[PDB]
Design a protein around this ligand. Structure first.
Ligand SMILES: *[C@@H]1O[C@H](CO)[C@@H](O[C@@H]2O[C@H](CO)[C@@H](O[C@@H]3O[C@H](CO[C@H]4O[C@H](CO)[C@@H](O)[C@H](O)[C@@H]4O)[C@@H](O)[C@H](O[C@H]4O[C@H](CO)[C@@H](O)[C@H](O)[C@@H]4O[C@H]4O[C@H](CO)[C@@H](O)[C@H](O)[C@@H]4O)[C@@H]3O)[C@H](O)[C@H]2NC(C)=O)[C@H](O)[C@H]1NC(C)=O
Ligand SMILES: *[C@@H]1O[C@H](CO)[C@@H](O[C@@H]2O[C@H](CO)[C@@H](O[C@@H]3O[C@H](CO[C@H]4O[C@H](CO)[C@@H](O)[C@H](O)[C@@H]4O)[C@@H](O)[C@H](O[C@H]4O[C@H](CO)[C@@H](O)[C@H](O)[C@@H]4O[C@H]4O[C@H](CO)[C@@H](O)[C@H](O)[C@@H]4O)[C@@H]3O)[C@H](O)[C@H]2NC(C)=O)[C@H](O)[C@H]1NC(C)=O
Ligand SMILES: *[C@@H]1O[C@H](CO)[C@@H](O[C@@H]2O[C@H](CO)[C@@H](O[C@@H]3O[C@H](CO[C@H]4O[C@H](CO)[C@@H](O)[C@H](O)[C@@H]4O)[C@@H](O)[C@H](O[C@H]4O[C@H](CO)[C@@H](O)[C@H](O)[C@@H]4O[C@H]4O[C@H](CO)[C@@H](O)[C@H](O)[C@@H]4O)[C@@H]3O)[C@H](O)[C@H]2NC(C)=O)[C@H](O)[C@H]1NC(C)=O
Ligand SMILES: *[C@@H]1O[C@H](CO[C@@H]2O[C@@H](C)[C@@H](O)[C@@H](O)[C@@H]2O)[C@@H](O[C@@H]2O[C@H](CO)[C@@H](O[C@@H]3O[C@H](CO[C@H]4O[C@H](CO)[C@@H](O)[C@H](O)[C@@H]4O)[C@@H](O)[C@H](O[C@H]4O[C@H](CO)[C@@H](O)[C@H](O)[C@@H]4O)[C@@H]3O)[C@H](O)[C@H]2NC(C)=O)[C@H](O)[C@H]1NC(C)=O
Ligand SMILES: *[C@@H]1O[C@H](CO[C@@H]2O[C@@H](C)[C@@H](O)[C@@H](O)[C@@H]2O)[C@@H](O[C@@H]2O[C@H](CO)[C@@H](O[C@@H]3O[C@H](CO)[C@@H](O)[C@H](O[C@H]4O[C@H](CO)[C@@H](O)[C@H](O)[C@@H]4O)[C@@H]3O)[C@H](O)[C@H]2NC(C)=O)[C@H](O)[C@H]1NC(C)=O
Ligand SMILES: *[C@@H]1O[C@H](CO[C@@H]2O[C@@H](C)[C@@H](O)[C@@H](O)[C@@H]2O)[C@@H](O[C@@H]2O[C@H](CO)[C@@H](O[C@@H]3O[C@H](CO)[C@@H](O)[C@H](O)[C@@H]3O)[C@H](O)[C@H]2NC(C)=O)[C@H](O)[C@H]1NC(C)=O
Ligand SMILES: *[C@@H]1O[C@H](CO[C@@H]2O[C@@H](C)[C@@H](O)[C@@H](O)[C@@H]2O)[C@@H](O[C@@H]2O[C@H](CO)[C@@H](O[C@@H]3O[C@H](CO)[C@@H](O)[C@H](O)[C@@H]3O)[C@H](O)[C@H]2NC(C)=O)[C@H](O)[C@H]1NC(C)=O
Ligand SMILES: *[C@@H]1O[C@H](CO[C@@H]2O[C@@H](C)[C@@H](O)[C@@H](O)[C@@H]2O)[C@@H](O[C@@H]2O[C@H](CO)[C@@H](O[C@@H]3O[C@H](CO)[C@@H](O)[C@H](O)[C@@H]3O)[C@H](O)[C@H]2NC(C)=O)[C@H](O)[C@H]1NC(C)=O
Ligand SMILES: *[C@@H]1O[C@H](CO)[C@@H](O[C@@H]2O[C@H](CO)[C@@H](O[C@@H]3O[C@H](CO)[C@@H](O)[C@H](O)[C@@H]3O)[C@H](O)[C@H]2NC(C)=O)[C@H](O)[C@H]1NC(C)=O
Ligand SMILES: *[C@@H]1O[C@H](CO)[C@@H](O[C@@H]2O[C@H](CO)[C@@H](O[C@@H]3O[C@H](CO)[C@@H](O)[C@H](O)[C@@H]3O)[C@H](O)[C@H]2NC(C)=O)[C@H](O)[C@H]1NC(C)=O
Ligand SMILES: *[C@@H]1O[C@H](CO)[C@@H](O[C@@H]2O[C@H](CO)[C@@H](O)[C@H](O)[C@H]2NC(C)=O)[C@H](O)[C@H]1NC(C)=O
Ligand SMILES: *[C@@H]1O[C@H](CO)[C@@H](O[C@@H]2O[C@H](CO)[C@@H](O)[C@H](O)[C@H]2NC(C)=O)[C@H](O)[C@H]1NC(C)=O
Lengths: 104, 97, 151, 185, 125, 151, 185, 151, 125, 104
């Protein structure tokens, strides 16, 4: 399955919420992962499952949605929240990532 | 035209036994088709006046065409053909004549 | 033919806010859930299996014209025990409180939070029975909970 | 808020059967006369007990209805399950049907040990939960006709909550009390 | 818990490249290793996943034969190698830790994602 | 599905003088009756459920025209297990001693008075097997309840 | 070879269903189109999916077949079980049959929620374990005809092993999803 | 209903060379067979009952015309659980690994020689699942059996 | 475990023969005794079987009434009594230990043969 | 049931194997017994059941067969193997014995 991220660019100043959308080709029931990659650094797992945060992840990042449509929301975007966000399904093989989104 | 076509050959089951007529100066024309069961198929143009039967015990099939006419004079062939419908390239070929 | 559906998920089962009216998320532990896979005469287990099957059918499969009576007709006996509702019908006929499948009751531990397997609330004369008339059953449930706590 | 054995508290919960749509039909009762069984959030069957009949002809065009595949398959399956579950049905003249245009309309003449007894048994096994108002068993009622028609979904039933128990119950006892009409079946 | 990917190196195109990630801080047998490729300026691309417990491999559709991945439990390492380097093979390779998917007769599938990643290894032709 | 009928009434079940031939009232304790609610292959339990259902139907429901065939056909599966009588039918077919549900035997504790769950008497040639030919079985039964006496 | 907790070894076994050939029918698949249901070590039914039909009429005449007790009773029972298990079957013209001479030949003519869906579901349950290669449910296939004929026993189980699971499965679901065609059945 | 067939014979069950492909005789102890008389959701128990019924029918009954569909039709419900294969079919429908009753796996103690009750192997993509994708199930089975042998 | 059959008797025809064997070395109650007659020059013939536990007897088709079997648990003895003798009644009589056949509801019949034999008693008329 | 031993005489020399056959009137599932009787001694149990050997019996004696046909095979013949061998069914009452075969 191939999944796409429609916005691909969020030019938002710090302080307000940001929303990212992920759409999958087929049904992926609550088996989606959201990763964050700092410039030049390795990606880190932010959200595993539909709406479950990884250990040590601040409660600012919230996942929602299911099936085909998923959303990731950042409430109070801080200085360190500027990174590239990636969407990966793992409901079936092979694992497929998204084209990414540049959030500045 | 009570024309029978007795054949021993290979097995009688699983084949289509057809009749084809060719009027002088024209092309071929399929006029009937019979399976080893009682099922049958006919040419719509002359279906109303043709009838083909099959006898499995004697391994033969016979065509009958009523209302004989000199306009129906032609050369008649009885042929065996096999149709394959299990995969994609479905194909039907008149095996022997 | 005994049912074979196993409940999804540590080890307990959680009823979401959609499966409950006028209530939030509820959750039952492993001990209470484990009784649903062994006993053939629990109405709550049957309804819980029905809800789990509905959720899994919605998630795994597609939707078209909502005419999914064939699916439930194929798998009606793999989720519930028809003789349970048959027995409830017999009890209703004989003028005895029966198991209307709407309301359930259970015992909560004040501090530990352990919960017994819910039992359905009996109804009679089209009105719910009041706990002064089945207090003995509640005491028996409390005694069973204490005995299980001992081991 | 009584405390049992000094350590246990009694708590209750109620199940929302209305979220069980799209997989199971849900049956519930509006009042004494009207009862409903709904499929999806689109369709349903309305069962009414009446002294007024809607069909006067003693016909049932079942073969013709099957030939013209216009009715809803789910509703036809439900009515087949209902009819097959009638115990000791032997008066075929007491059931009238109308299927013209794709709609379904069934009328049972209830005018013991008669056809009315078995029809009422099957009915209150289907609409189990609120049909007890119009009550070994030997069921007898003042109503003369039972009418089953199709309807669109609506917030109909206010006497009892929706529940799939009745349909799931009559599903088991489907071909269990049918008489033999022919030597070869 | 961290995974070190043996630094980085470059080589002439047409030759084979070998990169290994060494795991530590956890039982190497329980969790398998997935390999991700990121082209410069492009998104992440998945290649394969090898289960260390018996070393069972699942490969990508377009990476069969060209990419070979193995595991060594003696030194707790997962190695990857590419036969024929190409201009489009210049990228950064990431070694991620993934728990094997679990199925059971009495239960439902439990799928897993890449929890712990390692610092990437860059390869330029 | 499985049976769901529960036996009425400390905790045992007593068969009256009408349920037996050439015998008086006979009571069985809680420890033996309690096995009737989990065992799927006990013949005495099925027959005792049938007797209890008959008694309750006579007591509560009205009697008229004695056309109660509908009632028994409605709830036949909630009282007995059809596969048990099917197994007996197969055993009869294969030329093996079987059970026609007429005679039962049990073990008495002479002093204590506690008994075991009765097992039905096998039949061959249309005659009951004699105690020697299943004596080993009886021995096993004793051993079992001896273990039950340990706790 | 791995040793679980250093003390237990994992071992496997595979059953041999072919030894059950005097008591239960055994179903297997040859390829995408050919499937077989063997009874005994002499008899079997062949199931085929084709663009090509073999019956051109619409005469599934059964009273004559029962009158002339010439067919194999086991095969007739199997095909009766298959036909009864079809859910929501109402197009009688979609089924053709030829029983003359003691043979049995059945053709289901498959050209959502149609007769093809029910026939394919019943076929998938019958040929369970190897029919998935010919795939809510809404099963649709490119084939136009399903043909059931006689075969003598032969080593045909080359894609899936023989198994009595499918036939034992459709024994339970036999008359559960049949429409009513008459008031007094 | 519920199956009532009891496996033949200290107390274990031995599968001969004919019942297995490319394998010799294999015996299972009483501690594993005893589970087959109480559980309702074990593939291997139903298959063992089918094999035992076939063997007993061959031994104690004649053969003619190979028209034995009558016997299996009569006795199908006394040996297997239909809802179990119904559950397998449902799991196949939802795109989840299932079991076609062909391959089984079990745990052997190298020294003692005691084995667990075999669990049937899972198939996905029409192929046998590798050991790595159900290892947790193997560990759970080993833990349960070590707990059983501890007591 | 052996059985002794009390010598050999010779008596005139028409008299009653009382031949007994005592079993020592095992619990006499558990096992019954089966009687076998061997004519001089012919093969073995089965007479009957008596279970010592409650003394349950099964006789042969032709030996019914002609011969009787008794048991004594106090002396651990089993005895066979023949009413009338005839020229064809001269033979050798053996008594053999045999476990009673066992039947159960949850199980299958377990049938037994004659485990041990005692030395024969020669009866000549 | 009446069962008969077909050969009834094997004048076999010591050293080579010997085969004895038993045929039953009706079905007797693995419920046969083979006894050995030396001339002047009481019979002793050699084989019980299908092929199970009695305690202390040497491995040379081996039974086989089920249903109606049964076979007893002696691999090595010694001096004391020459006796009369008897075949008994115990699947039903009354018990039946064979005519016996004299090994000489
Ligand atoms: C097990 O057995 C129990 C009891 O035997 C049975 O429970 C009973 O279920 C019925 C049906 O749900 C309940 O009846 C409801 O009662 C409430 C409250 O009653 C009073 O409500 C107001 C005061 O608040 C009075 O004015 C009124 O006259 C009643 O006296 C009603 O509010 C319910 O009506 C609403 O809901 C219906 C269904 O949704 C609608 O059809 C109806 O039009 C009403 O909706 C309107 O109001 C809503 C807000 O209130 C609004 O959202 C809607 O849009 C609309 O405007 C209903 O009549 C009854 O109380 C339960 N208990 C008892 C003791 O009878 C179970 O049904 C049974 N289980 C099964 C499976 O059968
Ligand atoms: C499960 O399987 C077992 C195994 O066989 C089976 O047991 C058998 O049950 C039957 C049915 O009861 C028993 O048959 C009874 O036998 C007695 C005793 O008969 C002896 O005595 C008479 C003389 O009285 C002799 O002629 C005979 O040869 C025997 O020596 C009979 O007395 C019974 O008949 C009376 O009762 C019947 C019940 O309706 C009457 O219909 C019949 O007319 C007899 O009644 C007469 O006498 C009464 C007393 O004097 C009097 O009151 C009446 O008015 C009338 O004048 C009956 O035939 C059989 O012996 C059992 N076998 C064994 C080995 O014990 C179970 O029945 C079976 N269970 C099921 C459910 O299938
Ligand atoms: C549950 O689900 C599982 C997974 O889907 C499924 O497993 C599959 O079972 C089938 C059973 O038929 C397996 O198919 C067999 O595969 C072997 C191996 O094939 C190799 O060798 C052949 C050459 O023979 C190569 O062409 C091939 O590419 C492979 O390298 C085949 O050999 C089998 O065919 C033989 O046996 C058949 C038995 O009837 C014969 O009909 C057939 O003609 C072949 O016969 C040959 O061998 C005979 C001796 O055995 C000999 O006498 C003949 O003359 C001839 O030489 C067969 O096709 C399949 O591999 C399994 N899949 C996996 C992944 O293991 C279960 O079957 C399923 N259980 C159910 C449905 O109950
Ligand atoms: C579950 O997956 C297991 C992992 O298998 C890997 O992934 C699959 C998809 C394949 O790519 C496979 O090649 C991968 O290894 C799988 O276990 C593995 O199964 C293979 C084949 O069945 C085994 O290969 C054979 O190994 C033997 C030697 O085994 C011993 O040595 C190795 C290495 O030291 C140990 O790890 C083992 O435990 C043993 O101690 C070789 O002799 C044999 O060679 C034969 O084949 C070659 C090539 O055709 C010929 O040239 C030779 O002449 C021989 O004929 C194989 O190479 C592999 O050892 C095994 N690994 C482990 C760790 O068990 C397992 O079978 C799967 N389970 C299933 C499918 O049910
Ligand atoms: C059985 O019959 C059906 C349909 O039969 C036809 O329709 C019925 C309603 C009835 O009227 C019949 O009398 C009548 O004959 C066959 O269905 C066919 O399904 C295939 C699917 O592969 C279709 O073929 C594809 O069509 C594509 C464009 O629509 C085309 O791009 C595909 O090309 C591919 O293959 C070529 C050759 O390998 C390759 O070079 C290409 O690059 C590409 O991959 C392909 O041709 C047919 O059009 C369908 N026929 C129709 C719709 O009439 C069915 O195949 C047949 N057989 C079986 C076994 O079921
Ligand atoms: C069994 O139930 C009936 C009817 O029950 C009624 O319907 C149920 C679905 C519930 O909603 C009940 O709450 C409801 O009453 C009982 O008969 C009815 O009892 C009530 C009182 O309990 C009567 O109401 C009275 O009405 C008079 C005026 O007529 C007032 O002055 C009173 O203050 C009181 O409100 C009611 O009239 C009566 N009849 C009917 C048709 O409702 C019945 O008592 C109960 N018990 C038994 C043993 O039958
Ligand atoms: C299934 O069985 C019928 C036979 O039963 C037919 O229908 C009954 C209701 C009665 O009306 C019967 O009298 C009648 O035969 C098969 O249909 C029949 O096939 C025969 C073939 O020999 C047809 O006979 C022909 O009749 C014409 C005159 O109409 C003669 O000129 C011919 O020489 C020949 O005898 C008969 O007409 C036909 N009946 C109908 C109604 O079509 C049917 O074919 C059979 N199906 C299969 C698959 O065998
Ligand atoms: C099983 O098979 C038969 C059947 O037994 C007979 O039929 C049953 C339905 C019961 O009624 C039994 O009580 C009945 O005996 C058994 O054969 C039977 O053996 C008895 C031996 O006592 C015969 O009785 C004798 O009959 C003769 C002639 O009439 C009298 O002279 C005797 O005094 C004595 O009464 C009985 O006739 C006979 N049955 C038949 C039909 O002839 C058989 O023994 C039994 N199998 C086993 C292993 O016990
Ligand atoms: C039929 O049953 C389905 C459930 O199977 C009902 O659908 C559910 O409807 C509720 C109310 O609209 C939905 O709740 C909503 O949830 C979202 C979050 O997802 C929330 O943001 C909304 O404010 C609202 O509360 C629920 O999601 C929905 N479930 C599904 C699976 O769609 C439906 O209402 C029933 N239909 C009838 C006629 O009863
Ligand atoms: C149908 O099933 C039966 C068994 O259930 C199959 O017959 C069996 O065939 C095997 C040989 O393949 C027989 O084994 C034989 O055992 C004797 C024992 O002495 C040995 O001497 C032989 O050499 C051979 O190994 C087995 O007895 C036999 N079972 C019977 C007859 O009950 C039969 O092959 C199956 N049918 C098909 C078509 O596979
Ligand atoms: C009962 O069902 C019938 C058949 O679907 C309905 O009649 C059709 O309704 C649809 C939906 O409005 C219309 O598009 C068709 O034109 C109707 N056909 C005919 C012949 O009338 C009927 O409306 C349903 N009854 C109710 C009360 O909704
Ligand atoms: C389908 O069944 C028919 C009838 O049983 C088979 O035809 C008979 O087969 C037997 C066995 O060879 C012959 O003795 C008869 O003479 C046949 N009768 C007729 C009328 O042909 C038929 O062979 C079976 N189909 C196949 C393909 O074998």
């Amino acid at each position: 399955t191939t999944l796409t991220q429609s916005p691909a660019t969020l030019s938002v100043s710090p302080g307000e919420t940001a929303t990212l959308s992920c759409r999958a080709s087929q049904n992926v029931i609550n088996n989606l992962a959201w990763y964050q990659q700092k410039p030049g650094q390795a990606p880190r797992l932010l959200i595993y499952g539909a709406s479950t945060r990884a250990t040590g992840i601040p409660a600012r990042f919230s996942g929602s949605g299911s099936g085909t449509e998923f959303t990731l929301t950042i409430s109070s975007m801080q200085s360190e929240d500027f990174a590239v966000y990636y969407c990966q399904q793992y409901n079936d093989w092979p694992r497929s990532f998204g084209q990414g989104t540049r959030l500045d | 035209l009570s024309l029978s076509c007795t054949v021993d050959g290979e097995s009688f089951n699983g084949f289509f036994w057809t009749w084809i007529r060719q009027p002088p100066g024209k092309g071929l024309e399929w006029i009937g088709e019979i399976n080893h069961l009682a099922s049958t198929g006919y040419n719509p143009s002359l279906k109303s006046r043709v009838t083909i039967s099959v006898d499995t015990s004697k391994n033969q099939f016979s065509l009958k065409l009523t209302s004989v006419t000199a306009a129906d004079t032609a050369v008649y062939y009885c042929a065996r053909g096999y149709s394959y419908g299990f995969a994609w390239p479905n194909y039907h070929y008149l095996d022997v004549w | 033919g005994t049912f074979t559906w196993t409940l999804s998920d540590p080890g307990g089962y959680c009823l979401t806010r959609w499966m409950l009216i006028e209530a939030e998320l509820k959750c039952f532990g492993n001990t209470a859930v484990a009784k649903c896979n062994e006993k053939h005469d629990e109405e709550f287990c049957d309804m819980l299996r029905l809800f789990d099957f509905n959720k899994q059918a919605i998630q795994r499969l597609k939707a078209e014209a909502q005419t999914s009576i064939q699916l439930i007709n194929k798998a009606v006996n793999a989720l519930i025990n028809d003789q349970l509702i048959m027995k409830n019908h017999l009890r209703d006929i004989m003028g005895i409180p029966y198991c209307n499948y709407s309301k359930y009751w259970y015992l909560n531990h004040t501090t530990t939070g352990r919960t017994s397997l819910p039992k359905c609330w009996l109804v009679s004369n089209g009105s719910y029975l009041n706990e002064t008339h089945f207090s003995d059953d509640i005491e028996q449930q409390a005694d069973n909970m204490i005995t299980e706590m001992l081991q | 808020t009584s405390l049992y054995k000094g350590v246990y508290e009694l708590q209750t919960l109620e199940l929302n059967m209305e979220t069980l749509n799209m997989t199971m039909p849900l049956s519930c009762t509006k009042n004494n006369s009207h009862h409903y069984i709904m499929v999806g959030n689109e369709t349903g069957l309305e069962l009414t007990l009446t002294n007024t009949s809607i069909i006067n002809h003693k016909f049932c065009n079942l073969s013709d209805a099957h030939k013209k595949n216009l009715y809803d398959h789910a509703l036809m399956s439900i009515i087949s399950t209902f009819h097959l579950s009638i115990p000791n049905f032997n008066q075929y003249e007491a059931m009238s049907c109308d299927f013209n245009g794709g709609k379904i309309s069934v009328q049972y003449n209830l005018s013991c040990g008669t056809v009315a007894n078995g029809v009422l048994q099957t009915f209150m096994r289907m609409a189990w939960g609120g049909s007890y108002i119009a009550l070994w068993d030997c069921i007898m009622t003042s109503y003369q006709y039972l009418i089953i028609q199709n309807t669109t979904w609506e917030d109909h039933c206010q006497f009892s909550r929706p529940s799939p128990i009745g349909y799931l119950g009559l599903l088991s006892q489907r071909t269990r009390d049918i008489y033999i009409s022919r030597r070869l079946l | 818990v961290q995974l070190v990917q043996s630094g980085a190196e470059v080589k002439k195109p047409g030759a084979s490249v070998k990169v290994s990630c060494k795991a530590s801080g956890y039982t190497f047998t329980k969790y398998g290793i997935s390999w991700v490729r990121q082209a410069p300026g492009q998104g992440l691309e998945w290649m394969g996943w090898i289960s260390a417990f018996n070393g069972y491999t699942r490969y990508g559709q377009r990476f069969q034969g060209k990419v070979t991945m193995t595991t060594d439990t003696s030194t707790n390492t997962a190695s990857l190698e590419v036969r024929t380097l190409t201009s489009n093979d210049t990228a950064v390779y990431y070694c991620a830790r993934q728990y094997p998917d679990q199925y059971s007769s009495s239960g439902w599938p439990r799928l897993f994602a890449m929890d712990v990643w390692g610092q990437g290894t860059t390869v330029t032709v």
